Design a protein around this ligand. Structure first.
Ligand SMILES: Cc1cn([C@H]2C[C@H](O)[C@@H](COP(=O)(O)OP(=O)(O)O)O2)c(=O)[nH]c1=O
Ligand SMILES: Cc1cn([C@H]2C[C@H](O)[C@@H](COP(=O)(O)OP(=O)(O)O)O2)c(=O)[nH]c1=O
Ligand SMILES: [Mg+2]
Lengths: 399, 401
């Protein structure tokens, strides 16, 4: 079958759907990834076939989607979240990008469109040609969670007071293309999840579940990693957070290193500068593929993002999380912590000494490894990518 | 499980194993691709994990393996082909590469080794750690065909008259790693075939067969491929063999283009200058992803190589083959001809008119499309890659205690 994947120009959201693209390819299906011209090279460099659509995006240049406190969740609040975010997402997959992807769908006739959950050109393109389409999540479904509240809150109002920013945007989006608004444009003919169910939001529709393979981009085993380690190894990927936050970067590095273990840290050209002399047990590196490092690690300290955490799931590694709050990092870090596989230090509370002390706990207390390994078992049982391909074949067959 | 795949630094032999690497990766196994450092970039651009071994290879800087005349296939000839190729293959996966691959196999302990059939650091590494190992072909099994002739012939000479260059090579190669010569160092615990069994050599050993997915490398669809085709198309990928033959490169292109279809031809910069004005109906391109082009083509004119012919097979596309002799091109081209799916012109018989006349036939007589279609259908039914991964989990599982 012909599968048209689409993702806005961002490497991380691309990497999200790369293993699936490959599962589809080796099952024999024809796969295109449509993205903005500034993401075509990353698509090519993952081994796949790119279809440029639209203009270069260059995305790297009190209304939150991640609000769960149920008194903040009023209809007006959610309505306004959807007013604000529809403009963000329109921007990320605009009417030129949408019109190119629709024209390619019309000529190529895909049987199935899979769209990254922030790439709203996809369902327009699929409905324009009558193809079913799968909304592919890239962490928790903040948007589906918000929309469930919204739709129900909306149902209980003067028929004349149910203004819907999502319906207006997507009717406008679809209208050059003869695509009429239906809720399926908001959330897919169906949805594909990448987070394990135990950390996920209750949902009104089920999503396909999947044992998510986290693709970490270009990867080379460095020689130093060919070593059996002499003790436990810690991986520190907090470059952005530490550089953003009396106490100096080198203060943090020092306190982190003051443990009975080897530290591998991803750090800047710039940042290796103002750390000055590195502790004898801290290797700084621009990048190390996480799948080749984590099998030898007792702990990972990171920002709580989907790729990194999915790596920690897969290799059973205890986490110290200093959450981002950029999509779902804070909810997900609490979940990890409630299951006893992580310790959490919110950025306002971040101090060199605190990083160090949770880190020593993660090495010394066997309960965190044990919780981590349990989470790994239950990840091991989620549907394989081959199962997921069969589901998507069915999705497509049904029309 | 952990699959340690290994290939010498060569893009084609890598690509040959890219889709199997990925089938395994998305079935959930940990896959390492070990090659010389000059293949690392190619491995990353395929979306795979490179493990560098040995030093850069830089291979693009009487005695053949495609010899099939029975009177030439004496014991002394095969002996000497083995003596010579044992030196060439050592060069291609030398003591440093081998040592590096053995150290990594010791360290990472894979459940299966899958080695490109030309990469003899592979079975050695496997043996050092008792992993089963699967010798992966990249065309016909020329080496096993000769090895079976050689072992039969050797079996009945005088006992003192049974020099085996492969036994002497591989005993030497294995010795620093405590690895003993056994026939399985020559040909693998088992062999994975990439060519459809209808066109394969008979073997005195089993081979897993597979619906070989030909990976065409990095791919960006250009605007021109993405519009509706206005009339039938022909793919011409013969840039190399052409710029080696008073009869001019422009002449070959004029005749070949003199047919009732558009031509998409791959030419270098040097080639396009040397040909000058292109015919109206010819698009010269330095590269075009075959899986995106072929669905719209009535024929493909090419040199008979594995990757290209597997694409023609997959898309059911009639072929005009001008065989090179790098490996198995001559003998496969003859297999397709007999099935009716191709016309052949050897290098020695090649004129502009003969190429054009053959091309006109492929697009005019429906018997070629019919024959290519039938071949496609037999290909669609070979074991899938998912199936091949199961087969390969069985090798790993059976190969344990
Ligand atoms: C910094 C870094 C990231 N990665 C991985 C983590 C992710 O799977 C992927 C993309 O990075 P990023 O977008 O930071 O991941 P996240 O989803 O954690 O925010 O690359 C490495 O493998 N090695 C590295 O050194
Ligand atoms: C030259 C060329 C090759 N390819 C494919 C054919 C092969 O499958 C693959 C590897 O290159 P190559 O080794 O030239 O092909 P072969 O194995 O037929 O000798 O790239 C294209 O898709 N387009 C092109 O223009
Ligand atoms: Mg809670």
């Amino acid at each position: 079958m012909r599968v048209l994947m689409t993702v806005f120009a961002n490497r991380s959201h691309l990497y999200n759907m790369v293993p699936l693209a490959w599962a589809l390819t080796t099952a024999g299906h024809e796969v295109h990834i449509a993205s903005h011209p500034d993401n075509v090279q990353a698509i090519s460099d993952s081994g796949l076939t790119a279809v440029p659509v639209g203009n270069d995006l260059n995305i790297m240049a009190a209304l939150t989607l991640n609000e769960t406190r149920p008194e903040k969740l009023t209809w007006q609040y959610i309505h306004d979240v959807f007013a604000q975010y529809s403009q963000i997402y329109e921007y990320m997959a605009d009417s030129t990008m949408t019109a190119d992807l629709v024209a390619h769908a019309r000529q190529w006739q895909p049987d199935l469109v899979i769209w990254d959950a922030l790439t709203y050109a996809g369902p327009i393109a699929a409905e324009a040609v009558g193809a079913p389409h799968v909304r592919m999540l890239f962490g928790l479904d903040q948007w589906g969670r918000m929309r469930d509240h919204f739709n129900r809150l909306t149902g209980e109002r003067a028929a004349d007071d149910r203004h819907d920013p999502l319906a207006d945007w997507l009717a406008t989006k679809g209208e050059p293309h003869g695509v009429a608004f239906t809720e399926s444009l908001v959330t897919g003919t169906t949805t594909l999840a990448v987070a394990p169910p135990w950390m996920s939001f209750p949902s009104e529709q089920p999503a396909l579940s999947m044992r998510h393979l986290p693709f970490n981009g270009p990867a080379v085993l460095p020689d130093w990693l060919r070593e059996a380690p002499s003790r436990p190894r810690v991986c520190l990927t907090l470059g952005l957070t530490l550089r953003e936050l009396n106490v100096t970067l080198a203060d943090f590095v020092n306190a982190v290193a003051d443990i009975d273990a080897d530290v591998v840290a991803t750090f800047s050209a710039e940042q290796v500068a103002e750390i000055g002399d590195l502790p004898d047990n801290v290797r700084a590196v621009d990048f190390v593929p996480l799948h080749a490092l984590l099998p030898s690690c007792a702990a990972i300290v990171h920002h709580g993002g989907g790729g990194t955490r999915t790596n920690a799931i897969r290799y059973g590694v205890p986490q110290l999380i200093v959450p981002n709050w950029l999509w779902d990092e804070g909810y997900v870090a609490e979940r990890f912590a409630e299951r006893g596989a992580a310790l959490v230090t919110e950025v306002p509370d971040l101090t060199p000494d605190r990083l160090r002390d949770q880190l020593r706990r993660l090495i010394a207390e066997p309960s965190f490894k044990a919780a981590a390994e349990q989470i790994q078992k239950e990840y091991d049982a989620l549907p394989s990518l081959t199962e997921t391909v069969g589901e998507l074949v069915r999705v497509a067959e049904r029309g």
